[PDB]
Amino acid sequence: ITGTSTVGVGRGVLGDQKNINTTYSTYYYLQDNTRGNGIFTYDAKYRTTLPGSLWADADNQFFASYDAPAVDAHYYAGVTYDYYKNVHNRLSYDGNNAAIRSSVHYSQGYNNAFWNGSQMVYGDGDGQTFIPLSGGIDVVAHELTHAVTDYTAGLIYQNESGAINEAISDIFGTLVEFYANKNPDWEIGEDVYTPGISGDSLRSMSDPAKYGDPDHYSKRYTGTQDNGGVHINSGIINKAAYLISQGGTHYGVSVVGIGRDKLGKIFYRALTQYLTPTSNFSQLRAAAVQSATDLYGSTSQEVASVKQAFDAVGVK
Ligand SMILES: [Ca+2]
Ligand SMILES: [Ca+2]
Ligand SMILES: [Ca+2]
Ligand SMILES: [Ca+2]
């Protein structure tokens, strides 16, 4: 909508106060004109028609509990925008400042969030397995990264290319979580998963097996569930990325860590210059090696670490 840019205030899913960029035209809308061609957040009003209506508020204050998922969807989309722009010189998910749209209050008791090809969508959770999923910055950045992948490598969401698609979203969601630097970790979804249970999460990159996901290629899932295990076999690649960044010895193979920023540069380059819709794990290894080679040289510590890491998870 046409209007003047303003700054509202409210509280997110976890009860934290933050400022949000809004637009004023009779009502205050969740429309941030400070980033790209805008960030727009919508109310799906517990139904499944999308996007729903652009979020409208009478006084520019968002402290109602109904407002909380919108506040965080809106704010964490801005943080994710900032990460890709400031760290990778990428302007929105399409690299041309496409408007970022999010809908919250999707359906009833819905224990998931996703990118639907055009926008991000967040359920409120059932209060058991999840609370409103936009409360997790790694989840918001995971979903926007699906859009980045879909505009770049185009990794098909099935089997190994689909597992890479998922790991790319967990990797950048995690790098965005560290970028915001609140309570960062190598876990996925901990801020919104199982409010009744502390210390857990949906997935772990540092130890995928903690939740039964494979941490070695020999343990890959080959069945048909979950599009061929996309959220399962992503742990093999998540582990490799964790190792590249943090180092460690895994099944007897030692990896010298090179840190999160170089992990991010290497995988960003691989994603945008070398991966294709059908890339498998072996081809991701080659893509990452070539990327580290371009960035740091064929004799670098960085290239040797990438090889050590894929070796440690059994990917040649
Ligand atoms: Ca209000
Ligand atoms: Ca965290
Ligand atoms: Ca996390
Ligand atoms: Ca929990």
Swiss-Prot record:
Source species taxonomy: Bacteria, Bacillati, Bacillota, Bacilli, Bacillales
KW Ribosomal protein (keyword) present: no
Reaction(s) catalysed by this chain's protein: Preferential cleavage: Xaa-|-Leu > Xaa-|-Phe
Note on how the cofactor is bound: Binds 4 Ca(2+) ions per subunit. Binds 1 zinc ion per subunit.
Residues annotated to bind Zn(2+): H142, H146, E166
Subcellular location: Secreted
Function, as annotated: Extracellular zinc metalloprotease.
Domain of life: Bacteria
UniProt-annotated binding residues for Ca(2+) 2: D138, E177, D185, E187, E190
Protein name in the entry: Thermolysin
Organism encoding this protein: Bacillus thermoproteolyticus
Gene Ontology biological process terms from the UniProt entry: proteolysis
E.C. designation(s): 3.4.24.27
A molecular function (GO) term: metal ion binding
Record field: temperature dependence: Thermostable.
Chief place of localization: secreted
